[PDB]
Every structure is written in structure tokens, then in C-alpha cells.
């Protein structure tokens, strides 16, 4: 058996086609040492955080909330312009959301599917084909958003602006 992503290497033993974003890609064998299901929960949660984060790096280029209308469009400056009461409320809300994941992992670890936090209000994924397409699409858009946010962050460090402003002004290289 051989890896599909890397055709000359053997298949990583602890990943499987059942997992939505499977490509056979584990060259440094993290799953041979760590739990494959813990890695999947971590990958899915990192992906959701980076999906929101990539949208958040781009969105105040277009429009800002009226309260923060004076705040900067470079996100790394708007990070410090927010008051600590605001960041405390953000941290508390994320903490409330993370209680459900703290209860999912560490207590009923083996009951369910990775990333299944019981959040399906619009009742999608009922159709099996739709469920497959959405599972793989969530994984791939999460990975893409991870790469995209990492880029956009370091670009905001170099050019002291946001993504769109940087592109429009063609500030593509260190001045």
C-alpha cells in the first residue's frame, strides 16, 4: 500500500479514507504517535478558527461596525485599539463555546465524529451526498483558511496595512 498524496511513500497506517479530508498525507508520522481522532478534532477546530479569522482580516476593509468606525483597517493595530473589557467579553464568549468542546473531548471522547459539536441548526447534512460534500468542503476550506490567514498575518506585519489595501496600493514587497 502506498500514499496517494506522496506516491513513492508507504501509506500512513493510522489515517484512513473514512476521514473527510484524507489524502494519505502524513510524511512525518504524527498519527503513528498521537491519537488520530485528537488530531482530527484539533485540525477541524483550527480550521474553523482560521475560517473566521481570514474573513475577519478581510471584512473591515469593506465596512466597520459603527462603534469601531474610527478603528484602523490594518488588523494588527485594530487589535490594540479595542478595550480590554471588549477582549474580556470575547474571551468569555469563546470560553462558553469551548465548554461544549471541553465536555466533548476529555469525557465522551469516543462518542461521535470529529468536530461534531451538535451545531446543525439549519438541518443540513441530512442528505448523505450533501453530508459527504459538506464534510470534505469544511476540511478543505479550513486548511485553505489556515494558509490564507498565516499569509495575511505576516503580510500585515511587513506592509503595515490590511490585505485588500496592500493589494490595491500594490505594496507587494518590503519597502
Amino acid at each position: 500500500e502506498m500514499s496517494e498524496a506522496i506516491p513513492f511513500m508507504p501509506k500512513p497506517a493510522n489515517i484512513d479514507s473514512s476521514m473527510p479530508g484524507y489524502a494519505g498525507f502524513d510524511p512525518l508520522g504524527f498519527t503513528d504517535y498521537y491519537s488520530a481522532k485528537w488530531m482530527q478534532e484539533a485540525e477541524i477546530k483550527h480550521g474553523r478558527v482560521c475560517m473566521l479569522a481570514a474573513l475577519g482580516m478581510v471584512f473591515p476593509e469593506f465596512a466597520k461596525f459603527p462603534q469601531f468606525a474610527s478603528f484602523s483597517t490594518n488588523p494588527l493595530e485594530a487589535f490594540y485599539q479595542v478595550s480590554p473589557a471588549g477582549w474580556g467579553q470575547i474571551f468569555l464568549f469563546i470560553g462558553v463555546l469551548e465548554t461544549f468542546s471541553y465536555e466533548k473531548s476529555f469525557y465522551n471522547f469516543e462518542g461521535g465524529a470529529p468536530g461534531a459539536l451538535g451545531f446543525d441548526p439549519l438541518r443540513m447534512s441530512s442528505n448523505p451526498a450533501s453530508a459527504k460534500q459538506y464534510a470534505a468542503a469544511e476540511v478543505r476550506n479550513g486548511r485553505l483558511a489556515m494558509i490564507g490567514f498565516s499569509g495575511m498575518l505576516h503580510h500585515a506585519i511587513v506592509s503595515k496595512q490590511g490585505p485588500i489595501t496592500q493589494i490595491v496600493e500594490q505594496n507587494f514587497y518590503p519597502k
Partner: protein, 160 residues
């Protein structure tokens, strides 16, 4: 059967049901109170409030209370008694969730026993529908005041 956004999957149905009935009753009081405030004015209030309408009365009485005025502590007193009532009826909403005998919204408050006399198979739905309207109507009333100084009767009477 109205729940298109599936928000009852995101919380306990019992907590949501009691919260809905409480919102409906409080809003019933707010909507009825605003219409009554225009129609009738309890004695003496015209010197403390002038001619301020629904939301303006809150800010103006609390402005007078922000000075040391004895005759302006209505807001603190209503806040106190509603807070006291919510503190002592607080274990009820946790008993319902724990599987308790009492249903959402029932405090067994039937002095006249009008609900107890006839079978109460409709008065429940009467309250729920009237209160759902009361919430939306309060919303209307407050934001229309926030645009035009008219109250219930003034805004309904003409058409700006």
C-alpha cells in the same frame, strides 16, 4: 411548528419556553403601559415628568433620581421588587429543567380562579399569542418613539 432556524436544538426547550413566556408577559405590561400612560396620568406626575413619552420617562425620572430627589425613586423601587421576585422564584426554573412537576410558566397564580373554573385548554394559547404580539408591538412603539416624538395614540392618530 414555526422554528425554521432550528434554535431549539441550540438550547434546552424548557429554558427557552419559560424565557418566551416571561418575555411575553413583561412585554404585555410594557405595551399596555405605554398606551395607558398616554390615556391616563397618575396624579402629581406632570411636575416630575412633564410630557415625556415612554422611554423618555425612564431617562427623565432617573435623571431626577440622580440628584437626591425623594419623589423620583420609582425606577429603583420597580427594579428592587422585580429583582426580589426574580430572586425568590429563581429555583422554579431550575426545578422544571431537573424534571420537576411544575410546567414552564405556571406559578399557580389563579386568585380569581377564572382559568381553574373552565378547563384551561385555550387560555394558555390566548396568553402565548397575545404576548408574542406584545413583544413585537413594544418593539414597534419604542423604535417609532426613537424616530418621532409621538406615543401610541399620537402616532396612530395621524400619518407622518
Amino acid at each position: 411548528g414555526f422554528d425554521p432556524l432550528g434554535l431549539s436544538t441550540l438550547c434546552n426547550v424548557e429554558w427557552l419556553r419559560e424565557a418566551e413566556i416571561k418575555h411575553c408577559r413583561v412585554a404585555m405590561l410594557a405595551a399596555a403601559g405605554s398606551i395607558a400612560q398616554d390615556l391616563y396620568q397618575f396624579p402629581g406626575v406632570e411636575k416630575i415628568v412633564g410630557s415625556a413619552k415612554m422611554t423618555g420617562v425612564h431617562d427623565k425620572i432617573l435623571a431626577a433620581a440622580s440628584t437626591g430627589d425623594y419623589k423620583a425613586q420609582a425606577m429603583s423601587q420597580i427594579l428592587f421588587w422585580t429583582s426580589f421576585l426574580e430572586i425568590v422564584t429563581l429555583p422554579a426554573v431550575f426545578e422544571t429543567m431537573n424534571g420537576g412537576p411544575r410546567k414552564p410558566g405556571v406559578f399557580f397564580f389563579d386568585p380569581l380562579g377564572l382559568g381553574k373554573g373552565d378547563k384551561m385548554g385555550e387560555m394558555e394559547l390566548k396568553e402565548i399569542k397575545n404576548g408574542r404580539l406584545a413583544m413585537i408591538g413594544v418593539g414597534g412603539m419604542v423604535h417609532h418613539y426613537l424616530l418621532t416624538g409621538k406615543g401610541p395614540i399620537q402616532f396612530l392618530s395621524g400619518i407622518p
